[PDB]
Design a protein around this ligand. Sequence first.
Ligand SMILES: CC(=O)Nc1cc(C)[nH]n1
Ligand SMILES: CC(=O)Nc1cc(C)[nH]n1
Lengths: 348, 348, 348, 348, 348
Amino acid sequence: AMSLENVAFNVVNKGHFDGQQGEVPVSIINNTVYTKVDGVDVELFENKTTLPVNVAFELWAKRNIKPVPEVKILNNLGVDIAANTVIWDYKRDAPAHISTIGVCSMTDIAKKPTETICAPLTVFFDGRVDGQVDLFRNARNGVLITEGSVKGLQPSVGPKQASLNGVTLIGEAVKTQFNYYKKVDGVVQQLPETYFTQSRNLQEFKPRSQMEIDFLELAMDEFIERYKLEGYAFEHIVYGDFSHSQLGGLHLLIGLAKRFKESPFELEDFIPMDSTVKNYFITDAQTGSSKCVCSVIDLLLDDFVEIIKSQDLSVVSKVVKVTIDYTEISFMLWCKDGHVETFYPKLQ
Amino acid sequence: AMSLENVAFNVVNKGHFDGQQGEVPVSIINNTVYTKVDGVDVELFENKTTLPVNVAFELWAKRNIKPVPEVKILNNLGVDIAANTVIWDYKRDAPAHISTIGVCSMTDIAKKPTETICAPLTVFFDGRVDGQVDLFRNARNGVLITEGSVKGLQPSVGPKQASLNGVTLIGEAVKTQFNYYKKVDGVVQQLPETYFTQSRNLQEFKPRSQMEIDFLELAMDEFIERYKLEGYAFEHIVYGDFSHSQLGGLHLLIGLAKRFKESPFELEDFIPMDSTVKNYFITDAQTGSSKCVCSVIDLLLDDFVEIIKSQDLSVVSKVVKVTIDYTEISFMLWCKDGHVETFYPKLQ
Amino acid sequence: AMSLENVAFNVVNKGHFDGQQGEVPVSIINNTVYTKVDGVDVELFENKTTLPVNVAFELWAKRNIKPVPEVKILNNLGVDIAANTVIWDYKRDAPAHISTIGVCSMTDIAKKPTETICAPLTVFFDGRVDGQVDLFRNARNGVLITEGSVKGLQPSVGPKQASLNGVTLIGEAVKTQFNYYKKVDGVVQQLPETYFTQSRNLQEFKPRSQMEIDFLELAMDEFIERYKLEGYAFEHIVYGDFSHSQLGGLHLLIGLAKRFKESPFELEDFIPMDSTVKNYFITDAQTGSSKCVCSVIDLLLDDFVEIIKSQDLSVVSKVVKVTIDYTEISFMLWCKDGHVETFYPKLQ
Amino acid sequence: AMSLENVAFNVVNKGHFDGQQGEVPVSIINNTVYTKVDGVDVELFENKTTLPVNVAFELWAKRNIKPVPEVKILNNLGVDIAANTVIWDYKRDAPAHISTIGVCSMTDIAKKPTETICAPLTVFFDGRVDGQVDLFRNARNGVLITEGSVKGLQPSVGPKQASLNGVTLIGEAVKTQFNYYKKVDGVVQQLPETYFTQSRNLQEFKPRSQMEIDFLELAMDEFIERYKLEGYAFEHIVYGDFSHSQLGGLHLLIGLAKRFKESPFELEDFIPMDSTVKNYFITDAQTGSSKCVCSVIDLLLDDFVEIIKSQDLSVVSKVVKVTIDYTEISFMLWCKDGHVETFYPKLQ
Amino acid sequence: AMSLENVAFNVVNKGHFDGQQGEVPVSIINNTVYTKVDGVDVELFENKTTLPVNVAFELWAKRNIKPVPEVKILNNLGVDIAANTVIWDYKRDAPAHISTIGVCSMTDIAKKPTETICAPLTVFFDGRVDGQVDLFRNARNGVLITEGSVKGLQPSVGPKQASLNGVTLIGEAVKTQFNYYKKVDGVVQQLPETYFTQSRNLQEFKPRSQMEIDFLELAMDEFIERYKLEGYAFEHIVYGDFSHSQLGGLHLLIGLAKRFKESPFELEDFIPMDSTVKNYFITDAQTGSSKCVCSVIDLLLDDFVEIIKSQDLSVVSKVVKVTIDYTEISFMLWCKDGHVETFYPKLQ
Ligand SMILES: CC(=O)Nc1cc(C)[nH]n1
Ligand SMILES: CC(=O)Nc1cc(C)[nH]n1
């Protein structure tokens, strides 16, 4: 017996949908769900989605509360829908996928991912749930995550981090590093060798290597000297150039983190969604240097150094393609006299 | 197990709330309730009330579908709340009363009208439902309707008409004429002698007496001659004066009905609610004669004639009070040289 | 170059989307689209759909303005989507189908119905548009309408009427009677023998046979005598019984039309959508007789007489299935001593 | 002369409703109130309540701007309505009570708390306002606060802190510690002996005793040794266990504050309201340890130690009831072999 | 070809409107603009203005992204509209001006500021754009900013700071200090000699002189001794008096910044807009001292000291007028026995 009042009862008593029996009084006003608590209305949910308020409330209550892949990974792997769960996208305050399978009567296209309506969609399967590995084997298109070996299936070790209730973390009390598998048209696809983005924040950035510790603690010229980075334009690409009206370079998150500790700046997230490469309209508060579209990627500095040092520097300009988070990221590489001028995630 | 989906199931399958088990998918968008029917959304309800959309939907689904007293009668009798029913006010597209008793968890102040929260409120009791005559006996304040006699209690015969699903009618297949009883502080009141308004429409007006048939069929001067109405200003009060910029008189619905058959006119219902006296901003389309506040009452022409002929015509101006639909209606009576100049429901 | 301003320009200048170049200023406020005309805002569209206002505006502007099958026919034939058109559902003030093909970038699942996304969906094809008969030949699932014959394919003659801009009519200046073809999994189906509903209105009902003329002009007992209908409960089923609180029978639109000419009544369309059988909460204004769920079908009286006269009257109660508008309609048949007691479209 | 424009004038010129004469131009759009300031609209208020925008604006403008009891105290004391003031609930961005007395024409149930409509409600009275102590003496149900002695009335010394414009504080320039009194059915009730919650925040937590200073500065094992807390499960209850997928214990705010200084974590306030015990869906960012419903109380560590040390530890499981903020708080006490296993505010 | 989809394409690809060709799918729901990105809706803009959502979206996309005068300066100079640009007011999340010139078809009153509709309005002109100095010379009313000399026009050196994408800053990589010019009724007006407010924040306040460094680092009595400020009531005016229920003085931002480092407090910005003098409802969290209307100005402490030391202290009370940000600011000066009691920006 699925109902708005039962979903609300579960949120109030269990912190989320937990299949418990019960009902609480609910009032819906505009895009907000309230419940009566001792005569007064208490807000349970504000709809920030393009779905009807009561439908979005139910999908949010039915969100997966285990560590799940970050939405950028699912998107890069072509995931269209999840099997019998909701992957909540905390970057967008919305369900990661339009439709559901066995979750909500309003958004369900099927009750089971074995229904033929699901065959053309890449269904997300979670091996931690009974029967989901078998459902992936029977699925025409799909992405599977597991905590271990699936007999005969060649795995892809994914990122160390996962999203647990919107908190991206590397698990200590829980497992966040999964094996990934993908099928396209009934055929298991070999996932490519890839780098992974680190998913760090500007305000709580922590270094994850000796090189990263040295970047944050050492001065620009001594770091470049220590890591033999002369001629690789790190002064522009990583540290950033704030001397002209147009802000130069600044494409690695660690470079923004170093700058942030000294001088504040505004980052306008004009397409707010989870993605491997992020685009910001940046305004440096100290200098007034700005850039409408500043592409930023959070790679471990060692990974970025390996990528830039593995390029041929004899061409004026060329597209450099790098697999990051399972997707092909195009970078624009500009050279002059055998040295780098700039290297940035190519603005499509 | 009360729920939005269960209320919606009942509306879809039973035409209203009928206590049936079942659920249908629902979507709420702004003030509208939809249900999914074969992949597409179908509108079930548009909220025109000041209550939350899902709460108003439930009270409307739980509306009384038997002939009930017209809201103007309940209001005139001081009814605050109904016992275990919702009197739906079709003039306002809203519940007639703010709160409920044993109807909806969001609006309920009590489950049974015997709860002490109900003692100071005039509760409406319906003798057609088992135990309601007995609950009126135990209630401090209340109004009771019955189809037959109540032992020891003398009845007040109500109007012939009742509202059945928003259609005011005099029943032939159902009883619409009720016996009324009222208690104030545990004491059964003596309800006053009263006239009743006829609750007719302008577009489907039917005469209910030989005098009314004669008013509609005869010319003004011969009707006044036949019923000895000279000096009673019916030319102004009932027929209406459309010769000046300000529309004169026209306070009886039968007079508006007679005019409507010949020439159309606009009636702006600027306070849309059920009331004994209605106020309209009228604009006569043929002449351009108009009046911002034209008070209109639908009395049987014989009743209006009895009222006007029972007045002292020796005073220039005075307030004439008449019990109509159990309430005191003030009329302004203007006389000159022993004859009526005007007589209208006093705009206060 | 598709845009809101271009869609609005087409509506203002062409009465609908006509592929014309141009832009007009637009303002969107809540669910309404306005355009500036000489300094003031003029309403172009009010969104009554569950889609975003600008998306619904575009689909409505791009509606098919030729006579098209009534939505009840398309639904009964399992149509999921239309090829390169929008079938506007005027009963719901919304698009008949969730998604589009080659119509609007927000709702398109494909640009051409030959895309593999369309293969599992029953696509509606219109033989009056070039290449659509050929696209039906290549489609896995679909419904085709034509004005003439299709080589090798045997046709199913559809209803005489079609919907032209929301007006259901039998064409004189345009063709409204189509040949129907349907394919399921690449195989041209044999469409079943079917009756068709007449799609008439209560307020403008016209008889379409001598029997129907006789039903409307003759008295109940002489019509039943003339057409040898004794023992078939037409007094209850067709004419209606208004003598008890629950309105008896009244399931044929012609019976409601005959009643409507004499006495008015309220029909509450509680599931407002196009369907072969309609359900109304009816309240007879004259008697006060009412029914929460009164199923009404508009069959030609001759067709209804053929159906009822082709039934075995020896069973107390049974389900009678009749193909109407290509769908299986279940009727409940109740008999006693070899005569009909009642026969109604089964409320399920 | 109460008006929207006058309320807006007071907000603009006095910072709140101050009974001043004047009007400013106002525009209402959706749930926001604006005023024209030199040709442009400036936002004065955004309605986050379930009341109409103009009504909520007026109640917020008419909010009590003196230190008042925290809403959790008023709720625990059964307060239904306030006499001639609005207690604004800053946790909910809404009025603490549905109705008013002598405040706003839309929400007023009475002008004076002596009206019989108020007799069944527990009215809040403020002794700092002339005549309110006398109104409490005449009230059938009520809660009174005073800054001093009321002759013959036995007082209850309340918490040190009060809310002043949504800032909970212990007054230095103003008095925040009141005497509390309560009446139920005309009878003055003896308020129970109680502990009080400290109303601290996680981000600005300050210790209020030597034990609390020692908890925050000392390591877990030396604090437990110093205060003889061996066998009382403080490692689980207060410090928290982050080693398993389900976060263990962590029910005292001081324990969360200590953790917060070292590692950040997410606290989802899924029922956002003021209450003695708060429930959070917690996700520890460092470990990934989480709990859907983690009940947290802010007791002074000395008070919590007194409570836990005053319990019999010979039973496996039992409900321990403790008066906190005038209300009975149930705790679940789990013991094994004479030692505590867990002790938490019982999830109802 | 201006369109909603083209504006959205520019925002997605260029970070703002940049005149680029292209379209992206857009959905408008209530007051939010979304775009489809790989099947899911991503929020591009939330309308906080009183304009229609699509119109506000376009004006925000077309905002001036160069350093522009702060809105408080434009308002103080009487600016009504901008020539061929939108000055976005980040304090109000809205356009600084109601109408536009050559920007958006919905808000344009003209395409060029030379149109006679513009003659009575004070048009803002930007000398950094070709032809704008000439348009100011031809304009009847206007305000011009330049980065240099305009032949024959006497300049006014404006504030050092400008707003760049809502970040107020003193430019290093860009010029933020402009020359200002104003015309009223075809006549160039001499701008008055003025002080400028410093436009600092409470949370990131930095001193801009040795006196300001000394105010923040020295104790109250030694700063007053060092700068010979005895008898000038800085203890009240600048430092603030938190000893009584009504918070005394505290009218200089530097005084609030000094207090903020020690004890937190709530500043309610009840008229949220950019202005030379700001009014806050302040509540000191430590003491509970509060003031409904606390006028605060951010003057450099040296400028405030010069103003207060340039006043005659022999009158009990008088209005002191000071030009600040080109506007006349009235201050109330209260003296006793030749010493200052209080000096505050006069509450109108
Ligand atoms: C006070 C009171 O007598 N109420 C009654 C009596 C009866 C017979 N019905 N209701
Ligand atoms: C399967 C199939 O034969 N479809 C056809 C054939 C023709 C002549 N039209 N459509």
